[PDB]
Structure formats: C-alpha cells, structure tokens
Design a protein around this ligand. Structure first.
Ligand code: DGD
Ligand code: CLA
Ligand code: CLA
Ligand code: CLA
Ligand code: CLA
Ligand code: CLA
Ligand code: LMG
Ligand code: LMG
Ligand code: XAT
Ligand code: LUT
Ligand code: BCR
Lengths: 97, 198, 154, 42, 193
C-alpha cells in the first residue's frame, strides 16, 4: 500500500539476492556462454568497430565484482516485481471459489 | 497316416504330425512360420478350454432347471439378476485376479520354467513339464498326460468353440434358450429349421 | 439436441419435404392412364419415397432447419451407424484388397520375367491368393511383430 | 485355346471383367437395400 | 526382480539401493542421465514421505482435509488458522514471499554441490545420531528408505486421484465410505459410473 516502502523493499531484496545468492551461478553461466561469435571469432575480431566490450566501466571495486550493470539489471527486476505487487494489490479484482 | 481334413488334399510342409490334433488343416497360410505356430497352438488350447467351461456352464443349468431341480435364469439374463455385490465390484475383482494369472502364463510362454516356483514360499515349485500343459499341482489326480488324451482335449475344445458360436448366433436370431431351441426342433423337425427362423 | 439438431420424427420441415415431393410426383402422375405402365412406374417411385422417408425416421437421424438429415462423426455412441461402423467395414475391405495385391506382387517377384506376370495376370495364382485377405488383419499383425512387413535396409 | 486363356488374362480384358462383375454386385445390392445413409443393424 | 522371468537391463545390475531391474523405457540408458535420475528419485520420495502424514494427520484430527485447508487463499479477506488459532501473518502475499525466499535459498544451496554422492546422501549436519556408522547397516537403511519412499509416492498419487474422483473429500472420509459398505463402495463405481 505505502508505495515507496514496498518499492525499496522489493528492490533491496532483489539486489541482495543478486549479490549474495545467484552471483556465482550467474557469473559461471555468463563465463560458459561467452561473447557472441561470427564465423569462429567474436564480433570485434571480424572488423566491427562499435562491437567492442566496455572494459572501462565494467571494472569495479567490489570484493566480488558487482558493478553498474549488475545493479541496473537486478534493481529493475525488483522494480518490476514491486509494480506488479502494487497494481494487483489495488486493482480490486476478485475470482470466485 | 496322421489324418486328413480332406482325403484328396496334400499336407502342408510346415505341419509334421507332431503336436496333437494335427489333421493337416491350414488353407489360409496362417502358420507357415514356426513362431506364429508356437503362438497359435497356445491360443487354440486356451480358447478351447474357456469355451469348454463356458458352454458346459451355459447349457447344463438349462436342463437342470428344465426338469425341475433348481431354478436358475438364462445365461443371456443371468448378468442382470441382483447378487450380493455390484457387477462393478465383481468386474474389478475379476480384472485384478486375471491380470495376475495371465501375466504369469505370459512369462511361461515367453520363457518356460522361469515362473515355476512359488514367489512367497521359496519351496513348492513346479516340475518341468511343457508349455500349454502345466501339470504338477494343477494336476492333483496325476492323470497320465499322454498323447492319446491331448487329442481328446483339443477335440473337446474345438467342439466347445463351435457350440459357443451356435449358442450366441442362436440367441440373437431366435431369442430363447438353446434347450428351448433343441427340443422345439426335436419333436416336429421337418418344420423346425433355421429356414423357418429366417 | 446435439449441435441444436432436433429428430426427424419430431421435425416439421422433414415432413413438409416428404409430402411436397410425394404430391409433386403424383401431380406428374395424373396422366397417360390410371393403369398404363408409366402410371405403374410413377406409383412405384411414390412408394419408394415413402419407404425412404420412413426408414430415415426409424433410424433416429438428426435434422436441421433445412429439414434434411445431418451426420455426427464425433464418436458419440448413439450415431456409430453413421460413420464408425461403416468406417470399420471400409478399412477391413480396403486392407483386404491391398493385402492380396501385395502378396501377389511378392509371389511373382522372383520370376525370370516378372513384368510378364504384371501385364498378363496369373489367374490360378491370384485365385489361390484372394481368400487370404479374409484374415489379413491377423497375418499383418504377426508380420509386423516378425519384422517382416517393412523391407529392412531401405 | 490355351492362347485364348492367356489372352483373356491380359490387363484390359481382366479389368473389364472384374469391374463389370463388381458393378453388377453393387447394382443389385442397391436395388435391394435402397437409399442407405447408415448401418441400421447393430 | 520386478518381473520374474524378465531379462534385466544391462546397465542395471542390482547393486544400487532399490534396483529391481525396472526400466522398460530405457530412460537410464545414459549414465549421466541415471545419476540425475537417482538424485531426483530420492528428492521426490522424500517430499512425498513427508507430505502424506501432513495430509492424513490433521484430518484424523478435528480439522479440514488437505484441500479444504488451502481454501482461504482464494478469498480476499483470507486468514489461515493453525490448530484452530488465527495465524497472525496469515495473509497470502506475505506467505508467498517468505516461501519463495526460503525455498529458493535452500534449493540453490542444494544445487551448488558436485560430489555426486553427497547429492543424494550428504550427511554430516543432516545425520545427527550418526546412523552412517557401518557401511552394511548403512546400505540396508538406504534400501528401506527408498522402498518406503516409493510406497509414499504411490499413496500420494492415490490421494490425488481419489480427490479428483470425489471432489470435496478427504482420504479418511474415503476409507470410512469404503468400510461402511465394502462390497458396494469401491472403484467400480468410478470406472463404470
Ligand atoms: C467357417 C467354418 C467352416 C468353414 C468351412 C469352409 C469351407 C470352404 C467353403 C467355402 C470357401 C469358398 C472359397 C473356396 C476357395 C476357392 C478354391 C481356391 O482356389 O482356394 C485354394 C487355396 C489353397 O490353399 C493354399 O494355397 C496355397 C497357395 O498355393 C497356390 O494357390 C493357387 C491355387 O489355385 C495357385 O495354384 C498358386 O500357384 C499357389 O499360390 C498353398 O498351395 C497351400 O498349400 C494351400 O493349402 O485356399 C484354400 O484352400 C481355400 C481357402 C478358403 C478359406 C475361406 C474361409 C471362410 C471365408
Ligand atoms: C456345432 C454344434 C451345433 C449343434 C449341435 C446345433 C444344433 C441345433 N441348432 Mg445350431 N448353430 C451352430 C451350431 C450348432 N447347432 C452354429 C455354429 C451356428 C452359427 C451359424 C448355429 C446357428 C443356428 C441357428 C440360427 C439355428 C440353429 C438351430 C439349431 C437346432 C435345429 C437344427 C438346425 O437348424 O441346425 C443348425 C443350423 C445351422 C445353420 C448350424 C449348422 C451346424 C453346422 C453344420 C456345424 C455342426 C455339424 C456337426 C459336425 C454335426 C453336429 C454334431 C453331432 C455329431 C452331435 C439344433 C438343435 C435352429 C433352431 O434352434 O431352431 C429354432 C436355429 O434357429 N443353429
Ligand atoms: C478431433 C478430436 C477428437 C478425437 C480424436 C476424438 C476421439 C474419440 N472420441 Mg470424441 N469428441 C470430440 C472430439 C474428438 N473425439 C468432441 C469435440 C466432442 C464433443 C461433441 C466429442 C464427444 C465424444 C463422445 C460423447 C464420445 C466420444 C468418443 C470418442 C472415441 C470414439 C471412437 C472409439 O470409440 O474408438 C474406436 C472404436 C472401435 C471399435 C475401435 C476399432 C477400430 C479398429 C481397431 C481399427 C481398424 C484398423 C484395421 C481395420 C485393423 C487393424 C490392422 C492392424 C493390425 C495393422 C474416440 C477415441 C466416444 C467414446 O468415449 O468412446 C467410447 C464417446 O462416447 N467423443
Ligand atoms: C468419396 C465419395 C463418395 C462417398 C463416400 C459416397 C457414399 C455413398 N453413396 Mg455416392 N457417389 C459418388 C461418391 C461417393 N458416394 C459419386 C462421385 C457419384 C457420382 C457418380 C455418386 C453417386 C451416387 C448415387 C446415385 C448413389 C450414391 C449412394 C451412396 C450411399 C450408398 C450406400 C450403399 O451403397 O449402401 C451399402 C453398400 C454396401 C454395404 C457395400 C458393402 C458390401 C460388400 C460388397 C460386402 C462385404 C461383406 C463382408 C453412400 C453413403 C446411393 C444412395 O443411396 O445415396 C443415399 C445412391 O443412390 N452415390
Ligand atoms: C519422479 C520420481 C521418480 C524418479 C525420478 C525415479 C527414478 C528412478 N527410478 Mg523410480 N519409482 C518411482 C519414482 C521415481 N523414480 C515410484 C513412484 C515408484 C513406485 C511405483 C518407483 C519404483 C522404482 C523401482 C522398483 C525401480 C525404480 C528405479 C529408478 C531408477 C531407474 C529408472 C529410470 O531411470 O527412470 C527415470 C524416471 C523418470 C525419467 C521419470 C519418468 C516420468 C515420466 C516421463 C512420466 C511418468 C508418468 C506417470 C505414469 C504419471 C502417472 C500419474 C497419474 C496419472 C497416475 C531411476 C533413478 C529402478 C532402479 O534401478 O532403481 C535405482 C528400480 O529398481 N523406481
Ligand atoms: C522411511 C524414512 C527414512 C529413512 C529410512 C531414511 C534413511 C536415511 N536417511 Mg533420510 N529423510 C527422510 C526419511 C528417511 N530417511 C525424510 C522424510 C527427509 C526429509 C525430506 C529426509 C532427509 C534426509 C537427509 C537430508 C539425509 C538423510 C539421510 C539418510 C541416511 C542416513 C541416516 C540414517 O541412516 O538414519 C536411519 C533412518 C531412520 C532411523 C528412519 C527412522 C526415522 C523415523 C521414521 C522418524 C519418525 C518421523 C516422524 C514420526 C514424522 C514426523 C516428523 C516431522 C515433523 C519431521 C539413511 C539411509 C542422510 C544421509 O544420507 O547420510 C549420509 C542425509 O543427509 N535423510
Ligand atoms: C493401435 C493400432 C496398432 C497397433 C500396433 C501394435 C503395436 C505394434 C508395435 C510392435 C511392433 C514391433 O515392435 O516391431 C517393430 C518393427 C520391426 O520389427 C522388429 O524387428 C526386429 C528384427 O527382426 C525384431 O524381430 C523385433 O522383435 C520386431 O518387433 O519396426 C517398427 O515398427 C518400429 C519400432 C521400433 C523398431
Ligand atoms: C473361340 C474358340 C477358340 C478356340 C481356340 O482358341 O482354340 C482352337 C485353336 C487353337 O488350338 C490349336 O489348334 C491348332 C490347329 O487348329 C493346333 O492343333 C494347336 O496345337 C492347338 O493348340 O484355334 C482355332 O482353331 C480357332 C481359330 C479361330 C476360331 C474363331
Ligand atoms: C472363448 C469362447 C467361449 C467362452 C464362453 C464363456 C466363458 C461363457 C461364459 C458365460 O456362460 C457363463 C459361464 C455364465 C453366463 O451367465 C455368462 C457367460 C459370459 C455367457 C468361444 C470361442 C470360440 C471360437 C471360435 C468359434 C473359433 C473359430 C475359428 C475358426 C472357425 C477357424 C478356422 C480356420 O482357422 C482354421 C482352423 C485354418 C485356417 O487356415 C482357415 C480357417 C477357416 C480360418
Ligand atoms: C485338469 C484336470 C487335472 C486334474 O488332476 C484332474 C481333473 C480335475 C479331472 C482335471 C479337470 C479336467 C476338466 C476340467 C475337464 C473338463 C472338460 C470339459 C468341461 C469338457 C466340456 C466339453 C463341452 C463340450 C464339448 C460341449 C459341446 C456342446 C455341444 C455340442 C452343444 C450342442 C448344442 C447346441 C450347439 C445348440 C442346441 O440348442 C443344443 C445342443 C444341440 C446341445
Ligand atoms: C554504496 C554501497 C552500498 C549501497 C548500495 C545501494 C544503496 C544500492 C542500490 C541500488 C538501487 C536502488 C538500484 C535500483 C534500481 C534500478 C533500476 C534499473 C530500476 C528500474 C525500473 C525499471 C527499469 C522499470 C520501471 C517501469 C516503468 C518505467 C513503467 C511502468 C512500470 C515499470 C516497472 C515497468 C552499501 C552500503 C550497501 C554497500 C557498500 C556500497
């Protein structure tokens, strides 16, 4: 009901989960999937200028390697959850048994 | 001569006069394969034994109740008379019990001697007879399962299957019991046929 | 009823069609004589019409607003006479034809000049083969279990 | 006479006879049981 | 053997706890599939072994059957009740969130191990009385556990099918209905209605 309460609760829970529960599993899956390749090499090594990873902002001072991109992804996961909860908790909808 | 179902017609090469009842009859080439024949012999024996039990239990109650000893219904009616239990209950019991015994028979056809011994008591097995002829406990009177008596068996079974065919077509075209049918043909026969029935 | 169709015995439209057709016939009849052969033919046709309509009444068929009979092929048990039992009959006869044909083909395939027996039939051989179709289901079953129906390595 | 028996089993004649007999059979069936839309027996 | 007189699979000899040679669909024809299937079997068996007392006991008590006890949730003013006392945190959404967080944590914890013998028998902090003493009573305990688990799964699916046959009933109401007229209240009445 109280919007900002629920909003930050859902966001903080999502970010905590991303940093402390799935951070390893996710890093492992990203490692094993890797960068997209065309004809055997990545997109940069075939001559695509605009397709070079952004090494600059990805590096981070976290102890484990959480950065801006993980924050954006998991935080918005939390936001989408919060808005679903708000909308259907105030929509007055009722099924029947 | 191992018997001819047609005194002019020659045998088929795949029938050897080995199994009982061999009279050399298979015009439609159903068993020109040895595996087919091994399966069909078994089916014939078992269908015949069921037909024997069925026709006896169909017909003998009729004459027993028709010269006044017990009052039983007709076979094409007896399924309707109410019993101590539902017909659904009896059907489910029948299904489970026949499940068990038919899969046991199955494994013995597939692999003789492998389902012989009791699964509860590790003693009390069966001796090593043949497939289609499980003696032992199933043969308390210890009758000699000789060649003469197997031909007896399969002949009674074949005639019983034909008797069953008769009973059912009879009931569906005329509408009463087979003893009704018989005697009502018996006394005045030359006007009591399938022709006047049709 | 099923799909909104009411019974042809209870259908007014079904009756209307019957009597309309009957008396159209009988209007065409009132000529040539009251006993000449054309009149006899027309009266036979009238009686056949009555028999047809009454038989469709007996058999419990479903009629619509058109007044004509409809067919239910869904599997409902009140209507197996419509599709499923004639369907079983058809599948049996068709398998009979095809089975006899395949066994003839197989029987002649080892001849020195097989084409000679394709454009000129061996009638005694076919006469021996025609009646195996009577048990084609059982044979085809034991031929499938045998690994004998499908040409291996094709 | 044997040559005639062979000739009578050539493809067009054999099919002609087969289908004429089949036609007679279906024609007579429909002359006995006319206007069938269902299997009215069982 | 699950079928006396029936040849065994090649890959199923009879050493594993519960191997009776039953795999007619050869789904364990690949070894790295069979390992996952063993761990999966034990997980299902353990869940059902814990569940069926949770389905029988409170109905044998003075409470509602396993379906009735999960019906407040579909009404707006929902409120649970344990042992006939209104659960304070009984509303649906708090329960859904708490269930999610806890179960996700423990189940991912389970996923993060690679023994693969620990995957089905971890032990340690999960074997307090130390019944893993001897490797011969240990194998015996394994067999008895797996056997009871298959029995439990059988009984849970039986509960579900009896539920969908008599909607709005409990298992013990079914047993009472059957002991009230044995020769008349049986499965026939739901297979030939
Ligand atoms: C119902 C309970 C009681 C049933 C009693 C029934 C008795 C029969 C009564 C009516 C049957 C009418 C049709 C008779 C078949 C016509 C004669 C024939 O050319 O049929 C003869 C064939 C011959 O049978 C087998 O036929 C095989 C094939 O041989 C040959 O078959 C041909 C024979 O002309 C050719 O010679 C050809 O080269 C060759 O393929 C083998 O020769 C076998 O040895 C031989 O036994 O079939 C046959 O016997 C006939 C098979 C009939 C079975 C019909 C079952 C009911 C329907
Ligand atoms: C094989 C055993 C058998 C026996 C002993 C009988 C006996 C009898 N049948 Mg029946 N019947 C049988 C089989 C049998 N049937 C079969 C398999 C069918 C299905 C086609 C029928 C269909 C049938 C009908 C529709 C009717 C009878 C009727 C009758 C009675 C009148 C006689 C008659 O019309 O002949 C039987 C007519 C037939 C078409 C069947 C012919 C039997 C064939 C030839 C096989 C039997 C031959 C066998 C080797 C010789 C008899 C055994 C003997 C040596 C002991 C009679 C008591 C009539 C009746 O009851 O009167 C009201 C009648 O309504 N039967
Ligand atoms: C397109 C979807 C669909 C399908 C696939 C079916 C299918 C079926 N419906 Mg259904 N139905 C449908 C939609 C459908 N329905 C809808 C939308 C409705 C609402 C109106 C219904 C309402 C409905 C009702 C009310 C009923 C069905 C029933 C049935 C069954 C009847 C046929 C049968 O009994 O088997 C076949 C019958 C046989 C006797 C089997 C013999 C066939 C032989 C074995 C095959 C022949 C092969 C060859 C000749 C020999 C083999 C040779 C081989 C060895 C090589 C069938 C399986 C009936 C049912 O429940 O069945 C009891 C029934 O009562 N349906
Ligand atoms: C796929 C196309 C198709 C189908 C499914 C049908 C189906 C049917 N037609 Mg039709 N027809 C067709 C094409 C078709 N036709 C075409 C293209 C023409 C134009 C040439 C016609 C012209 C036509 C006429 C003029 C008539 C039919 C009739 C019939 C009905 C006959 C029933 C019968 O014969 O009794 C039963 C037959 C059997 C049971 C034969 C099987 C028995 C075997 C031989 C014995 C086996 C024993 C084991 C039937 C429902 C007749 C009808 O009554 O209409 C209502 C009829 O009058 N048709
Ligand atoms: C999902 C639960 C589950 C799982 C994962 C397993 C897994 C395994 N079982 Mg087990 N089992 C179970 C339940 C289960 N079982 C139940 C309920 C019983 C009692 C009936 C048994 C009784 C049993 C015996 C006696 C034996 C095994 C054996 C095995 C092992 C080899 C078989 C195999 O590889 O198939 C893999 C399993 C699957 C791929 C799951 C199949 C799911 C399919 C696709 C759907 C099932 C449909 C089903 C009919 C649903 C009905 C619902 C309702 C409508 C009735 C394997 C590790 C054999 C073994 O060697 O032990 C080590 C053996 O001896 N099981
Ligand atoms: C038929 C019941 C049963 C049996 C025989 C076993 C047997 C076994 N378990 Mg297991 N377990 C079970 C149920 C069972 N479990 C259930 C329901 C769960 C939770 C879903 C677990 C979870 C579990 C884990 C996580 C582990 C084991 C382990 C083991 C193995 C070593 C422990 C041991 O030997 O103790 C012997 C077993 C018994 C003495 C069974 C008697 C216990 C009675 C029945 C307790 C009464 C239950 C109670 C009345 C019901 C309500 C309680 C509820 C509120 C909790 C062993 C083969 C450990 C292992 O593999 O070690 C390496 C392992 O780590 N189990
Ligand atoms: C429903 C209506 C149809 C019912 C058919 C009944 C089930 C048929 C499946 C059994 C057939 C079969 O196993 O043979 C399978 C047949 C080949 O047939 C196989 O041949 C082998 C080598 O000779 C063995 O003899 C097998 O025993 C034999 O079944 O092929 C297939 O149909 C594909 C299935 C896998 C092979
Ligand atoms: C129609 C009857 C046909 C008779 C027939 O084909 O064979 C009868 C014979 C065939 O028969 C042949 O006859 C020859 C001498 O006539 C030789 O003897 C052959 O050996 C003999 O097989 O052909 C005819 O004679 C019919 C000629 C045309 C008749 C029309
Ligand atoms: C199983 C059977 C009968 C069983 C009946 C039973 C149990 C009756 C049971 C009950 O009565 C009770 C006790 C009590 C009642 O209240 C209820 C019912 C339920 C009524 C008959 C089979 C009967 C089976 C029959 C008739 C088989 C026919 C086979 C034929 C004709 C084959 C011939 C050929 O195959 C050859 C040999 C060679 C080929 O080349 C050519 C052809 C011609 C194909
Ligand atoms: C196993 C053993 C071992 C141990 O050790 C010992 C012991 C115990 C002894 C044993 C047992 C055995 C047994 C069981 C036997 C049985 C048999 C039978 C039942 C037969 C029948 C059998 C039966 C049969 C054939 C039948 C037949 C029938 C018939 C013909 C009929 C006819 C008819 C008809 C159609 C119709 C009409 O209307 C009527 C008439 C005319 C009449
Ligand atoms: C410094 C630090 C810290 C802190 C941290 C923090 C504080 C965090 C965060 C964070 C966050 C807080 C994040 C967030 C968010 C994000 C995002 C990214 C979002 C989103 C959203 C979206 C994207 C969407 C929306 C929407 C729309 C727009 C429309 C409608 C609805 C929806 C929902 C769809 C600590 C001390 C702890 C540790 C050390 C370091």
């Amino acid at each position: 009901l109280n919007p900002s309460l629920v909003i930050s609760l859902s966001t903080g829970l999502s970010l905590f989960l991303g940093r402390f529960v799935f951070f390893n599993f996710q890093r492992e899956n990203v490692a094993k999937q890797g960068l997209p390749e065309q004809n055997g090499v990545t997109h940069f090594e075939a001559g695509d200028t605009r397709a070079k990873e952004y090494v600059s902002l990805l590096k981070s001072n976290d102890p484990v390697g959480f950065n801006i991109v993980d924050v954006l992804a998991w935080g918005s996961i939390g936001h989408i959850v919060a808005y679903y909860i708000l909308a259907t908790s105030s929509n007055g909808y009722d099924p029947k048994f | 001569k191992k018997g001819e179902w047609l005194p002019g017609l020659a045998s088929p090469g795949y029938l050897t006069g080995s199994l009982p009842g061999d009279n050399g009859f298979d015009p439609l080439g159903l068993a020109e394969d040895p595996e087919n024949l091994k399966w069909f012999v078994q089916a014939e024996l078992v269908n015949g034994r069921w037909a024997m039990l069925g026709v006896a239990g169909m017909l003998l109650p009729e004459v027993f109740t028709s010269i006044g000893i017990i009052n039983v219904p007709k076979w094409y009616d007896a399924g309707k008379e109410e019993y101590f239990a539902s017909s659904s209950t009896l059907f489910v019991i029948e299904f489970i019990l026949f499940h068990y015994v038919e899969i046991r028979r199955w494994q013995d056809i597939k692999n003789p001697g492998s389902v012989n011994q009791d699964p509860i008591f590790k003693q009390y097995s069966l001796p090593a007879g043949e497939v289609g002829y499980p003696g032992g406990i199933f043969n308390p009177l210890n009758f000699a399962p000789t060649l003469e008596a197997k031909e007896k068996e399969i002949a009674n079974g074949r005639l019983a299957m034909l008797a069953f065919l008769g009973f059912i077509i009879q009931h569906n075209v005329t509408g009463k019991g087979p003893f009704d049918n018989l005697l009502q043909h018996i006394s005045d026969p030359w006007h009591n046929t399938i022709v006047q029935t049709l | 009823d099923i799909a909104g169709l009411t019974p042809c015995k209870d259908s007014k439209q079904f009756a209307k069609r019957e009597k309309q057709s009957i008396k159209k016939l009988e209007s065409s009849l009132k000529l040539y004589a009251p006993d000449s052969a054309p009149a006899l033919a027309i009266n036979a046709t009238i009686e056949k019409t009555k028999r047809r309509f009454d038989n469709y009444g007996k058999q419990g068929l479903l009629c619509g607003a058109d007044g004509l009979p409809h067919l239910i092929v869904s599997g409902d048990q009140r209507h197996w006479g419509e599709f499923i039992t004639p369907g079983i009959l058809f599948l049996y006869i068709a398998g009979w034809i095809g089975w006899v044909g395949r066994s003839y083909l197989i029987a002649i395939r080892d001849d020195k000049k097989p084409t000679q027996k394709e454009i000129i039939i061996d009638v005694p051989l076919a006469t021996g083969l025609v009646f195996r179709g009577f048990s084609w289901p059982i044979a085809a079953y034991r031929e499938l279990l045998n690994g004998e129906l499908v040409a291996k390595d094709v | 006479m044997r040559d005639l028996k062979t000739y009578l089993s050539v493809a067009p004649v054999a099919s002609t006879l087969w289908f004429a007999a089949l036609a007679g059979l279906l024609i007579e069936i429909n002359r006995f049981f006319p206007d069938a839309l269902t299997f009215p027996f069982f | 053997d699950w079928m006396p007189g029936q040849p065994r699979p090649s890959y199923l000899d009879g050493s594993a706890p519960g191997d009776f040679g039953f795999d007619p669909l050869r789904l364990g024809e690949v070894p790295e599939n069979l390992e996952r299937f063993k761990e999966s079997e034990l997980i299902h068996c353990r869940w059902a072994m814990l569940a069926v007392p949770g389905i029988l006991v409170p109905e044998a008590l003075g409470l509602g059957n396993w379906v009735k006890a999960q019906e407040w949730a579909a009404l707006p003013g929902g409120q649970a009740t344990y042992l006939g006392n209104p659960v304070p945190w009984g509303t649906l959404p708090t329960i859904l969130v708490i269930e999610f967080l806890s179960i996700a944590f423990v189940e991912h914890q389970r996923s993060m191990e690679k023994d693969p013998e620990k995957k089905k028998y971890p032990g340690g902090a999960f074997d307090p009385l130390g019944y893993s003493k001897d490797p011969k009573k240990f194998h015996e305990y394994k067999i008895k556990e797996v056997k009871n688990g298959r029995l439990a799964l059988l009984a849970f699916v039986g509960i579900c099918v009896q539920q969908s046959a008599y909607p709005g009933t409990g298992p013990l109401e079914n047993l009472a209905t059957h002991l009230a007229d044995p020769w008349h209240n049986t499965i026939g009445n739901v297979l030939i209605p």
